[PDB]
Amino acid sequence: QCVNLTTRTQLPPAYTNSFTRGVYYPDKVFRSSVLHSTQDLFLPFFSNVTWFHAIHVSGTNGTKRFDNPVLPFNDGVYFASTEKSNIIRGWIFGTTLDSKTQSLLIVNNATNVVIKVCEFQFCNDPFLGVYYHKNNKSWMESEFRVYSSANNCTFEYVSQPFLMDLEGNFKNLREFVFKNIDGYFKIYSKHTPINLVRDLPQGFSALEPLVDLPIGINITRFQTLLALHRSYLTPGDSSSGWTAGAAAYYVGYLQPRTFLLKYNENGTITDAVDCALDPLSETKCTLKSFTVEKGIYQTSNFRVQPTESIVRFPNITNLCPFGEVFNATRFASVYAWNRKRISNCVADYSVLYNSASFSTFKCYGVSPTKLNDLCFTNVYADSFVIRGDEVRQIAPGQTGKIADYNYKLPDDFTGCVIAWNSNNLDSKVGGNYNYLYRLFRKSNLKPFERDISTEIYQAGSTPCNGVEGFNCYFPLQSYGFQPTNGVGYQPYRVVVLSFELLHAPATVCGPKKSTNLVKNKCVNFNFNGLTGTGVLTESNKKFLPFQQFGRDIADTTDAVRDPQTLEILDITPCSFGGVSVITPGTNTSNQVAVLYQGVNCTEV
Amino acid sequence: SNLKPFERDISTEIYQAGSTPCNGVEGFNCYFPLQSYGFQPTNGVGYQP
C-alpha cells in the first residue's frame, strides 16, 4: 500500500556538463584495432544533464524531501547514479503511470532483481520502505509501497542484482542507458569506482549490454525509485536521512547521432569521437582517423534551404461567365434544356461556393473545395427552374418524373449540382406558367438526352394522331409558380456543372489565390506548372509576348514571365557550395577555421 | 490519416465527419468508429469470416 508525502513544490532544475560518457556497444560483434562509424541513438559529447538530489533540504526549518519528479522519456534515457549507500532501488516506465496504460516496474532488493510488466495502479509518490534488522544489519529488508494494485501481467523476470551492494567517501558511478526500439527494451549497464568527483568525472568507460526485454509497450514518461529508511510517520529533525542526500542522480536525453568508435586490440571501446560537435570532429569523421594532419580538407557541403513555397497565376478581371449564367434574368424550360459550354477562360468556383446563397451544393467525384484546384478540359453549365421537392431528383442514380422522363443522370458523375431559391424572381401573383413539364413518355431517357417533341402520347390503345381526347393528353403541363406557394412548389434555380476530365487539353482552370510576390529569397516556385527552387530577381530582359520561358545555353531555365504584370523575373539557384576545414596538426592545437567556397558571408 | 506499419491504435474516439466537433458524442457528422457484421452461415462466400 502507498503512503502520501508532501508536495514536491516544483524545485527549479539544475544543469551540469557531461564529459564524453554514455558510449555503449551498438552491436554484438567483436572487432579489434579498427575505427568504425555508427548512426544510432547516443548522448552528445559535452551535453547538458539535469541533476537531482536523492534527499533535498530547501525549507528554512530543514525539511528533507525526496526529489522524484516525473521526467519525459523521449527515445532513450541515460541515467547516472553517484551513490554510496544503496538508496535507489529501481524505475518505472509508461505513458499514464496508472490503471489506464500498460506499465513496467523494475525493482532491486538485497537479493535479486524483479522485472514486472502489468497494469499497475501507482501512487503519486512511490518508494520502498526499507529497514535494518536489530542483530545482523548485513542486509536491508524492503517493503514495497510502489503501487496499489497489479493486473493483466504479461512478463516476469528475475536475475542477479542490477545494483551492487554499497555497504566513508567511497562513492561509485552506476551508469545505465535505457532504449526502447521495435518493441524491445534494451538496458546497457556499467559500474565504476570514483574518488572526490562530485559531478561526472572526466574519463571514459564503455557501457556493456546487460539485458534485452521483449516487452513491446509504449513509453513516454518515467520515474525513479528511492528507498525510505526513515519514518514517514515521525520525521526526524536531521541526520535521519543521509547527510542531506549527498548521493544523487543525473539524467540526460539521447538523440540520433553518428559516432566514430575506436576498438583497440582487445575489443574494448577506448575512445570515441562525436561527429557533429565541432568542425575538427567533422574532419575526423570524413577522413576516418583519430588524428588529422596539417592542411586543408573538404568535409561537408553547404547549401541554402528555401523556407517557403510560392505559386503564381494570371491577372484578368475577365473570367468564366458564371455570373452571367447564374444571375441571368431568364432561364429556359426544363424539358427543352439549354446547355452552355464554358472554355478558354478561367473559373473561380470560390465565388459560387462561398456565396452562402445557394440552397444545395452537391459535388460528385470532385470535392467542392478542390474545384478551383483541378483543371478541366471543358465545363457544361445547365441552368433551369425546378420545383423544390424535385431538387432531390438531381443527382446520380435517382428515380422520379424529372430523373426518368426528363433527363437521365448516369451513375458516374464528375460534377456538381447547385441550387438556390428563386421565389422572388420566377414567381408571380397570377402564376408563372411559362415552364412546362412532361409527366407521360413512352420510355425512360438516355443520359444527357434532350427531347423537345410535342407529340400527344397514347395512353390507351386507340391512336391520338396529334389530337387529344379519350386517353390522349398533351405532353406538357404548366406549374403554378406563385410567391405564396409552399416549399415543394416554389421555384428553385438549379445549375449543374459537368466537368470533363480526360487526356485532353485543359481550357478551364482555377487561378486560386494569386500568392503575393515574395522576391530576393530563394523559394520553391511553381509558375504555370514549372516546379523549381531558386531566387527570383527583377530582370531587364524582354520576352516576346507569346514566350513564357527563358533558356540558358544549356537546358536550365533562367527567366520566367510574370502572368500578372510582365516585368520578366530571372531565376538563380541560391548559392550552394562546400565547407573546408583549415587546421594544423592535431598534436599542436585543436583550433580550426571554416572556409565556404564560392559564396560571400551573408547567407552563412 | 493512413497508419504507420505494424502500428496499433486502440482509441475509441468518435471521429468528426464534419466541421463541428463531436466531443465524444455521436450525432450530426459524428459516429462511433467501429461497426459489426452479421457473420452468418447463410451468407455469401465474399462475406464469410
Partner: nanobody, 127 residues
C-alpha cells in the same frame, strides 16, 4: 454543403409533449436567426416560433403561447422547440429555417425571406 436537418417528429397524444430539433451541417448556425414553421393540411406555412442569433430575443405565435418554448445551443449548433399541451390543430409538416434579420430592431416578430430550409418532419396529434 449547407444542410439543415430536422428530427424528433412523429405521432403523439393530445395533451402530451414532443420535442423537435434542427441541426446545421456545413456551416455555423450561431450567426443566423432560426425560425420554426409549420404547414397544416390545407393551410399555408405559418410562423410558429423564432429565436435570435444570441438567443436573447424570441417570438411566438399566439396559438402556441404558453405551450411551446424555443431554445438554442450555439456550442452544439442546434435549435430546439419543446411542445407541451399539444392539440390536434398542431398536426403539420414542420420546418426549421435560418436567416439574417432583414429589418432594424432586435425583435424577430416580423417575417422576411429565409436563407436556408430543411426537409422537415411530420407532427401528428390524434386521439
Amino acid at each position: 454543403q449547407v444542410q439543415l436537418q430536422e428530427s424528433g417528429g412523429g405521432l403523439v397524444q393530445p395533451g402530451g409533449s414532443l420535442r423537435l430539433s434542427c441541426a446545421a451541417s456545413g456551416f455555423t448556425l450561431d450567426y443566423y436567426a432560426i425560425g420554426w414553421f409549420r404547414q397544416a393540411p390545407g393551410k399555408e406555412r405559418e410562423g410558429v416560433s423564432c429565436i435570435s442569433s444570441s438567443g436573447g430575443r424570441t417570438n411566438y405565435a399566439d396559438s402556441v403561447k404558453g405551450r411551446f418554448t424555443i431554445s438554442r445551443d450555439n456550442t452544439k449548433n442546434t435549435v430546439y422547440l419543446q411542445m407541451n399541451s399539444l392539440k390536434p390543430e398542431d398536426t403539420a409538416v414542420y420546418y426549421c429555417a435560418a436567416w439574417e434579420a432583414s429589418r432594424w430592431y432586435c425583435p424577430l416578430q416580423f417575417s422576411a425571406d429565409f436563407s436556408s430550409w430543411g426537409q422537415g418532419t411530420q407532427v401528428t396529434v390524434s386521439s
